[PDB]
Amino acid sequence: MPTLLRVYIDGPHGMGKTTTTQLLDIVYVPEPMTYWRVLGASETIANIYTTQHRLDQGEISAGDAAVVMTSAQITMGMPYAVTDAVLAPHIGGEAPPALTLIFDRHPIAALLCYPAARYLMGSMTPQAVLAFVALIPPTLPGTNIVLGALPEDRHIDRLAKRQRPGERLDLAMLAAIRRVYGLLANTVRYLQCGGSWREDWGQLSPRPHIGDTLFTLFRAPELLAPNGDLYNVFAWALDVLAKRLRSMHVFILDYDQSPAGCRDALLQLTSGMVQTHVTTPGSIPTICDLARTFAREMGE
Amino acid sequence: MPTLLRVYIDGPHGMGKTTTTQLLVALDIVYVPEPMTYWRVLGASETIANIYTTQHRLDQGEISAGDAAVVMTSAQITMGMPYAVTDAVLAPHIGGEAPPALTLIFDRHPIAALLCYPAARYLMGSMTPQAVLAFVALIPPTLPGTNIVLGALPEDRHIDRLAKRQRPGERLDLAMLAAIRRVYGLLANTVRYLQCGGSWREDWGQLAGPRPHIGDTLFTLFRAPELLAPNGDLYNVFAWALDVLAKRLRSMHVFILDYDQSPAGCRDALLQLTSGMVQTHVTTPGSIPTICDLARTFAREMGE
Ligand SMILES: O=c1[nH]c(=O)n([C@H]2C[C@H](O)[C@@H](CO)O2)cc1-c1ccc(Br)s1
Numbered sequence: 344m345p346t347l348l349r350v351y352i353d354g355p356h357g358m359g360k361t362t363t364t365q366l367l368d369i370v371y372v373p374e375p376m377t378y379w380r381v382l383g384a385s386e387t388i389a390n391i392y393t394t395q396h397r398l399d400q401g402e403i404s405a406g407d408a409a410v411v412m413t414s415a416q417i418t419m420g421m422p423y424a425v426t427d428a429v430l431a432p433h434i435g436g437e438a439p440p441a442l443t444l445i446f447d448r449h450p451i452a453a454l455l456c457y458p459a460a461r462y463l464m465g466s467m468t469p470q471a472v473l474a475f476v477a478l479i480p481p482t483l484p485g486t487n488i489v490l491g492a493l494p495e496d497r498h499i500d501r502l503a504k505r506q507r508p509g510e511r512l513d514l515a516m517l518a519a520i521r522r523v524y525g526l527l528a529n530t531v532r533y534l535q536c537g538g539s540w541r542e543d544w545g546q547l548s549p550r551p552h553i554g555d556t557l558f559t560l561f562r563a564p565e566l567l568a569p570n571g572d573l574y575n576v577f578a579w580a581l582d583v584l585a586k587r588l589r590s591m592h593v594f595i596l597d598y599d600q601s602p603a604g605c606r607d608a609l610l611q612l613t614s615g616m617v618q619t620h621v622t623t624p625g626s627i628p629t630i631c632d633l634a635r636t637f638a639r640e641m642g643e
Numbered sequence: 644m645p646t647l648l649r650v651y652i653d654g655p656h657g658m659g660k661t662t663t664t665q666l667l668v669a670l671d672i673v674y675v676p677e678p679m680t681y682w683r684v685l686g687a688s689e690t691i692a693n694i695y696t697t698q699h700r701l702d703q704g705e706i707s708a709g710d711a712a713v714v715m716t717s718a719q720i721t722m723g724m725p726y727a728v729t730d731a732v733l734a735p736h737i738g739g740e741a742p743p744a745l746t747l748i749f750d751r752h753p754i755a756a757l758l759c760y761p762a763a764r765y766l767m768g769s770m771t772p773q774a775v776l777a778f779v780a781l782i783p784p785t786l787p788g789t790n791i792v793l794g795a796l797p798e799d800r801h802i803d804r805l806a807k808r809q810r811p812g813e814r815l816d817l818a819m820l821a822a823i824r825r826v827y828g829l830l831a832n833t834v835r836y837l838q839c840g841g842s843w844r845e846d847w848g849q850l851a852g853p854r855p856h857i858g859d860t861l862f863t864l865f866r867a868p869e870l871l872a873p874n875g876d877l878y879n880v881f882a883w884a885l886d887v888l889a890k891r892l893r894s895m896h897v898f899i900l901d902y903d904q905s906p907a908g909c910r911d912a913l914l915q916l917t918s919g920m921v922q923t924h925v926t927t928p929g930s931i932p933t934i935c936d937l938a939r940t941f942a943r944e945m946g947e
């Protein structure tokens with residue numbers, strides 16, 4: 344069968360991502376803005392930022408913020424969820440690629456990365472973050488995740504330039520979110536280096552120290568038994584997290600440059616990403632139509 | 644290679660499902676109960692109490708529809724968390740379909756929290772079909788040998804039992820009973836529909852035994868203004884979800900059990916249906932013990 348290349352450009356918002364991918368037998372699946380602002384619900388992004396603002400002003404409580412916050416993360420990952428779902432069966436085993444799919448963000452941003460950041464923000468229960476993790480679909484072969492690198496003040500400047508409507512410059516949420524992708528990038532090398540959280544978990548009391556991995560966020564008092572132990576339910580959700588992330592291929596793009604440069608770099612990492620065969624002759628065309636119809640309908 | 648026999652007992656609450664499964668188990672056979680301790684304490688505080696009060700608040704006109712949806716959606720993520728973790732942990736051992744070396748008697752399948760309960764809440768107006776389809780996209784891949792025993796039981800006889808089998812924080816809500824009763828009937832019809840060659844897209848225009856009418860399946864829940872494009876066709880985002888709703892269920896093995904009989908009767912009834920069920924091999928020979936302990940542990944920690 345012919346081969347495919349799936350590339351998910353991911354990282355914190357405000358790093359110039361959509362811009363540089365649009366500057367790129369290659370389809371680009373955008374961010375489903377229409378689905379957030381209109382299809383799934385009314386102005387999901389506004390809701391997120393507003394709510395946290397009410398929590399920051401104490402106009403509402405950590406728990407009401409959690410439910411609203413929780414209910415929104417659902418609307419945000421839905422389009423990505425279904426795409427991976429319908430896409431999954433066509434992807435074959437790892438292997439010029441007959442089709443290159445550039446996606447704007449992977450599902451883990453919705454089922455892991457943003458949820459965690461909001462936890463880090465006192466707006467999402469760690470119990471909920473782990474519920475989402477538990478739902479992270481299996482990791483198809485050839486899943487290349489590009490995460491971005493960019494100096495803080497530079498990223499603050501950028502965050503400032505363009506924001507979806509309803510947003511708010513939230514410098515904490517920036518640091519919260521920059522923290523997560525940083526930890527996530529660390530977890531992957533850890534898992535890949537042979538690290539076992541169960542074996543290293545006691546330390547929280549050639550590879551990253553589990554203190555610099557995503558595992559360190561779940562030493563959360565609400566996840567532990569009166570004697571300090573993690574409840575098994577939760578220990579298992581970390582076996583899923585471990586399971587899902589270890590197979591991903593993470594590629595770093597330095598965003599501290601010009602779109603032309605970022606673009607030129609993005610295409611550059613491509614030389615080492617992993618391709619896979621498709622399942623049917625007609626997989627490529629079906630995939631091509633899905634990615635174009637996804638774009639057409641949800642990209643504003 | 645050893646085989647495994649997985650059996651998920653689901654259906655509307657208040658039919659006596661938990662009892663009989665225990666009964667049956669009291670006769671290489673491990674149970675996986677409902678994770679009440681997670682619902683009452685671990686994941687959140689009193690989730691079931693939260694659910695029945697919210698609906699109730701909405702009905703009293705004391706909150707809105709968007710408050711309920713936000714709360715309900717939130718409550719459902721908690722309710723199905725344990726099922727979701729269990730399924731993902733077990734999945735790698737589940738192998739090809741093939742007496743069983745191990746029999747795992749589950750209490751409710753992931754789809755109950757990712758589909759049926761959501762769908763029913765939607766029918767109650769405390770959930771949106773967009774949220775349902777979000778959950779549906781999150782239903783995990785249907786493992787081989789997914790045998791589901793649903794429970795039949797006449798309504799009045801159900802009402803009486805429900806009135807009896809309440810949960811801590813539960814309210815006698817017949818409306819929800821009827822809703823939950825309708826949703827599970829559609830599930831069975833749907834699985835029959837999908838298996839007799841049915842295709843929703845083909846029969847979309849139209850909105851044991853013979854193939855059911857698409858309008859007697861779950862696909863009919865999703866004919867909502869919210870999901871339609873001005874051109875009148877389902878938006879593709881949802882259409883693609885319904886594609887997964889059909890993929891997930893098409894390979895399940897549904898069996899129906901009659902709950903209009905004594906506890907020792909359902910036990911024997913269910914014990915009868917069990918023989919015609921699909922087993923499967925395990926991935927590693929040592930997968931059985933592991934599976935045995937995950938189940939016992941799930942039981943020991945979240946059962947109550
Ligand atoms: O889950 C989310 N939650 C969230 O608050 N955001 C924010 C960041 C920015 O302000 C705007 C667009 O990225 O919305 C994004 C996401 C995700 C988008 C796509 C996926 Br997958 S997850």
Ligand SMILES: O=c1[nH]c(=O)n([C@H]2C[C@H](O)[C@@H](CO)O2)cc1-c1ccc(Br)s1
Pocket residue numbers: 656677691694719722723726751752753754755756757760761810813
């Ligand atoms: O999603 C749910 N929603 C819900 O309202 N219930 C109610 C019904 C009854 O009052 C009680 C116990 O099932 O909880 C149960 C569930 C689930 C339990 C297990 C799974 Br999977 S889904």
